[PDB]
A paper describes a structure:
[name] is the [name]/VirB11-like ATPase that powers T4aP depolymerisation. PilB is the ATPase that powers pilin polymerization in the T4aP. T4aP polymers can be rapidly depolymerized at the base, resulting in fiber retraction. Adjacent packing units adopt one of two conformations: open (O) or closed (C).
The three OCOCOC [name] structures described here are the only examples of [name] in this conformation determined to date. Nucleotide was absent in the methylated PilTGm structure, possibly due to the lengthy methylation protocol or competition with sulfate during crystallization. We hypothesized that this conformation in the absence of a nucleotide could have resulted from the methylation process, rather than representing a physiologically relevant [name] conformation. The isomorphic low-occupancy and high-occupancy ADP OCOCOC [name] structures have an RMSDCα of 0.6 Å per hexamer. The RMSDCα of these two structures with the methylated OCOCOC [name] structure is 1.9 Å per hexamer. The model built into the C3 symmetric map is consistent with the OCOCOC [name] structure (RMSDCα 1.3 Å/hexamer). Before symmetry was applied to this map, it more closely matched the methylated C3 symmetric structure of [name] than the pseudo-C3 symmetric structures, suggesting that the slight asymmetry of the latter is a crystallographic artifact.
Residue numbers in the entry:
A (entry chain A): 2 to 354
B (entry chain F): 1 to 352
C (entry chain E): 2 to 357
The structure:
């Protein structure tokens, strides 16, 4: 009934987010969907006492000045949390995310064995892309945890915001949160070469400066991880090249062909059973043929190379993953078709074999 | 301050559309389109300020005094909600107040085609409801937001200036932020929206360059974004969005739009042929793979031809095709249907 | 007060403007031309004394901070006035414009009956154009007053500045003065749709933003009035189109062809008697043929349709109006010819075997 009990239940019930707003009971997001708790609806007095109970006095003043506040806090013996407090219809409202210290393993996440091998790469650019909540941070956290476990190197992450904490194991891990630890991605990236890193996570490739920063890191002997909100390997490569002026795109294509070591495009789909989510992932691992196609500006022909790189490189097109999920009845036909980038291709391959 | 409450009660009881308060005239109510003065003495400058200020918050009174303009909404328990505009004329306060029903109308009550219901089922993307002021945009948006609220277990956040339709929680969590009270501005609300775990976001009118980039970012990162524009057609809407950006960034914006656009609705309310009420005429564009290439290929005007043949497959409909059907079914007069066609000669060919 | 007496003489003598400046007697503008009053020339002491006699303490302080001041004021039993005070050659100077409360009728203004029929339009765009002091606000005030009399609708005006005041009749009339009631045309037009209007006066079509606002008003079921400074219907339509980029001119021409309901272009000419001025006006009322010519980018061919549209559509070219002013001997031959856009056509009209 208080903030401590709600946050403990959020962790205990495997929720990702707790929502507190007027005229609704506390609600928790489990596997992406909100489920209300068996409690009376809150009023404006309730949402204010609950949200204020986890703020410092200085934080309460800054929220009252702007009607907005981002913060993080810890509950001893429980978990860390990300909070956002705001105002709607004249009342306090809040959303609170658990940030787990412990990452589940690759097999628990449904990630193919090639993801474990990407975590062993000495150098290059590895891109994990997809929409919000498609599993990107969990894959990145699993990869970084394997690196942390296996290497004696320096890992620096720049995140907006940090979604997983990595205690030091064999690596030295420094994590900078945008907006608190560092002013911006640009400022962190301006000094990242002066911090003796070996592995760097740069977050979303939001602008040209960040793309150039990720390419330089990957060219100078570092393992660079970044995200995009693209849905396929080809769409990912096109977005990176096409954001640059036409005159500088030849160099970017040449740069990408040398340093790119893997592209993972994930999506979480509803299970046909109606409970839980299943991972759909497109995997592109560059071979000499794909690297030439990038340099030759034959980006779209990379898809044909992914269709035949399953046994050799662990590649898998998005349609090839949906096909396997369909034969095992993990997703319905309606969900698979609404997600296929080419439903006619997936339809024809289902009829044969 | 209790006189204003009684005037609005009289406005509701007499079936009026709008209440007018201005100096040197009695309160006037629009009934069936025509103004009628109430049998009361005329107001002075003190009165129009006193009545209008009685329904303002202290901030709203300081916001109004800073700009000599103010839009707002408020509710009267047991009566109705109302949208108000207060302004200044000849050195005195004036006000107009419209009626906002508590009960949100259905798709069929609003005259919205079944394709709007399928747009309400989209999991992510950008859906634009456009038109000039009072073209039914908030009513259409509320119907869309009410269907998602009814059907989904997701988090809906709206940013409104002001909040018009209220959406009680159903199966969704719905948070509605009013600019100038709950949040300082659209810019400030959008700065924090990514930390609030939203699934569906209403950002209001695409009023400037900065909000459009924010709306494209929300829709690109896996969210369903609703926004409005002032344009009157799908093609005019797409051109307006791209052309506000500097020439060097327009290639990316067209590329983003080809990926993220999920629907364009351009509405307009016309008087009914019976002489009572207004009926919705709507142009609906839902991008298919063909339209997405036309967007990427910068052949935006050829999109109109695609809408003419996408009715059965995709539920598409040009404005002229909608006006033709409303005219044949006797919902509108010939002058109103002709007075709205963007190409009156095309509608003639369909008439034959 | 001498100032009280000067303003009474200005009103009584039908002057439009009173001028007070150093080394000249007070001068009043009568029929567009300045005429000095039979008084000794004023000095700097006089001009500061006369202008300060009508200022509040707050106005005197603001004028002294900038050497500029706009204001309006009323004189009980006389008239209201719009004033401007400034400084020149180290001395105070002032100009004062009268704002009449009473609007003259259409026939008094010399406006043809077709203008009255334009006031009965339920929707569309009606443009009243001409140079400064060509009677535009006066024509607009007569139209607004007829609408106010005949309709139960909401009239909103946005003006820079307000020229005629309209007491309520059957309409509710709200008049917003730029720089006092509202910050700008842009802000008034930003909220005008939320103000439940039926008839809107938007002032000068100064930029694309205002033209786009008027087109939106005219398309959504409103009657919109606006002004330009063009001298003919064809010149008026082209001026509106040519303000847009070349790629967007097709749409603007298409919009105008749909919503345009009337174009009036005026000029005030001296009378043959030497007293008063007579209105010369060109009237274009769009028919289906003219609307097509607009859409087809055949604007110059619109004039030929106007030459034959008096009886059918109530149209009237400038030359046809000048012809009528010449037959009634209201203007001299030189004045009529000096304004004709085509003197040879007007000559042909005068040398007619069907002349009567």
């Amino acid at each position: 009934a208080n903030m401590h009990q709600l946050l403990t239940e959020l962790v205990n019930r495997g929720g990702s987010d707790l929502h507190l707003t007027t005229n609704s009971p506390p609600q928790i997001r489990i596997d992406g969907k909100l489920l209300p708790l068996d409690m009376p609806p809150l009023n404006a007095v309730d949402t204010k006492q609950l949200c204020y109970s986890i703020l410092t006095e200085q934080q309460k003043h800054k929220f009252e000045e702007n009607n907005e506040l981002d913060l993080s806090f810890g509950i001893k013996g429980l978990s860390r949390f990300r909070g956002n407090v705001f105002v709607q219809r004249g009342a306090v409202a809040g959303v609170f995310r658990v940030i787990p210290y412990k990452i589940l393993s690759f097999e628990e996440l449904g990630l193919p064995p090639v993801v474990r091998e990407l975590a062993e790469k000495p150098r290059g650019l590895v891109l994990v892309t997809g929409p919000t909540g498609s599993g990107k941070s969990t894959t990145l956290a699993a990869i970084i945890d394997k690196i942390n476990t296996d290497r004696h190197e320096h890992i620096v992450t720049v995140e907006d915001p940090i979604e997983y904490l990595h205690p030091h194991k064999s690596c030295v891990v420094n994590q900078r949160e945008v907006g608190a630890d560092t002013k911006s991605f640009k400022n962190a990236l301006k000094y990242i070469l002066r911090q003796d890193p070996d592995v760097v996570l740069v977050g979303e490739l939001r602008d040209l400066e960040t793309i150039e920063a990720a390419l330089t890191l990957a060219e100078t002997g570092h393992l660079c991880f970044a995200t995009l909100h693209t849905n396929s390997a080809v769409q990912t490569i096109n977005r990176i090249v096409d954001v640059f002026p036409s005159y500088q795109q030849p160099q970017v294509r040449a740069q990408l062909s040398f340093v790119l070591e893997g592209v993972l495009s994930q999506t979480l789909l509803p299970k046909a059973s109606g409970t839980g989510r299943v991972l759909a992932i497109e995997v592109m691992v560059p071979n000499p043929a794909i690297r030439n196609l990038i340099r030759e500006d034959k980006i779209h022909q990379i898809y044909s190379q992914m269709q035949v790189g399953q046994e050799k490189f662990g590649m898998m097109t998005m349609n090839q993953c949906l096909y396997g999920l369909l034969q095992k009845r993990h997703i319905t036909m309606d969900v698979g078709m609404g997600r296929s980038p080419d439903p006619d291709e997936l339809k024809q391959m289902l009829t044969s074999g």
